[PDB]
């Protein structure tokens, strides 16, 4: 067309290459709904290959009926958001064996990498907490060779989440620390996960003034408020 001055000084090998490319070089996927589906689903390792079948039968590793139970028992661990404490060795072990059965590893998880994970979490959270601590205060006795007590708030762990933003996993956790950690003053934070409803301002409904005792849906939410 009009690019004779530019498409010509490409060499003959380059042009003979670039008159051949097409769509259909891959075996990939690109539908992002389907990528999120395959990242969501739990997958169990199966066997069809005969050499790997005799390799997994020799080392006394079991059939997929045990790896599916191991998936379920690695998922059923009380993960550390619910327990409000750093996890222990059995929780680490069960979660890591469930993850290793998710990825395909049908072997055994070593007992020293759990302690390695423990020290990794130690130094990770110590780095984050230290570079939040030395920003609310200038420790004059430290950082030198010759006031009171402060509590770090969630706004501070958002404020030094960005002044030193390299310190994070950049996964979901930093997204929720940026997106949902800051609360407006009508947020009703000290709660029981349900009392921010509109009907808890408008009067507990009483009971059983009826022969058939079918009730209304504004009473069912008061029933579920108690639990």
């Amino acid at each position: 067309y009009k690019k004779i001055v530019m498409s010509l000084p490409l060499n003959d090998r380059n042009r003979l290459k670039m008159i051949t490319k097409e769509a259909g070089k891959r075996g990939f996927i690109f539908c992002s709904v389907f990528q999120a589906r395959l990242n969501n689903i739990p997958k169990i390792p199966i066997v069809t290959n005969p050499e790997s079948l005799k390799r997994v039968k020799s080392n006394n590793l079991k059939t997929p009926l045990e790896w599916s139970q191991d998936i379920m028992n690695g998922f059923n661990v009380p993960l550390a958001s619910e327990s409000h404490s750093l996890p222990d060795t059995d929780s680490f072990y069960l979660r890591m064996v469930g993850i290793a059965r998710e990825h395909g590893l049908v072997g055994t998880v070593d007992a020293r990498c759990v302690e390695l994970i423990s020290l990794a979490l130690d130094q990770y959270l110590k780095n984050i907490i230290e570079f939040t601590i030395d920003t609310v205060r200038y420790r004059r006795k430290k950082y030198s060779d010759y006031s009171g007590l402060y509590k770090s708030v969630s706004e501070m762990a958002a404020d030094k989440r960005d002044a030193k933003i390299k310190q994070l996993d950049d996964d979901k956790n930093e997204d929720e620390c940026a997106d949902e950690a800051k609360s407006i003053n009508n947020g009703n934070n000290s709660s029981k996960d349900d009392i921010g409803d509109i009907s808890m301002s408008s009067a507990v409904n009483e009971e059983l003034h009826e022969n058939r005792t079918i009730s209304l849906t504004n009473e069912d939410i008061y029933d579920s408020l108690s639990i």
């Binding site: 690019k3 530019m6 992002s32 990242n39 929720e176 997106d179 003053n185």
Partner: protein, 111 residues
């Protein structure tokens, strides 16, 4: 250079006909650093266990913290649903703009 005019054809293939001069230079100096880091980490991962799955491990090691994440719509939908539980607060009814309380505004501050 061959890749300056190849970047000219790449930019023109996505309908970018006006740009400056140092923009393919910046694209080439990005691609050099990215490929050098990827191949160095892949040489590490091949001394550990070159091949294509080695390159896949070396570019999955650094996908996790720099470029645009993949299919983030369902996590954002979950996060939106956690934020859109709370009903909207009571608004003023005096047809104007209401400020926050005075300590939450950039006025009672000092230098």
């Amino acid at each position: 250079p061959r890749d300056v005019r190849l970047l000219h054809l790449l930019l023109a293939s996505q309908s970018i006909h006006q740009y400056e001069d140092q923009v393919p230079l910046q694209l080439m100096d990005f691609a050099h650093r990215y490929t050098q880091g990827v191949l160095k980490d892949a040489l590490v991962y091949n001394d550990y266990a070159l091949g294509v799955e080695d390159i896949r491990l070396a570019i999955a090691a650094r996908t996790q913290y720099q470029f645009k994440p993949t299919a983030p719509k369902e996590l954002m939908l979950q996060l939106a649903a956690e934020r859109n539980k709370k009903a909207l607060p009571q608004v003023m009814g005096t047809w104007g703009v209401r400020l926050p309380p005075e300590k939450y505004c950039l006025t009672a501050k000092e230098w």
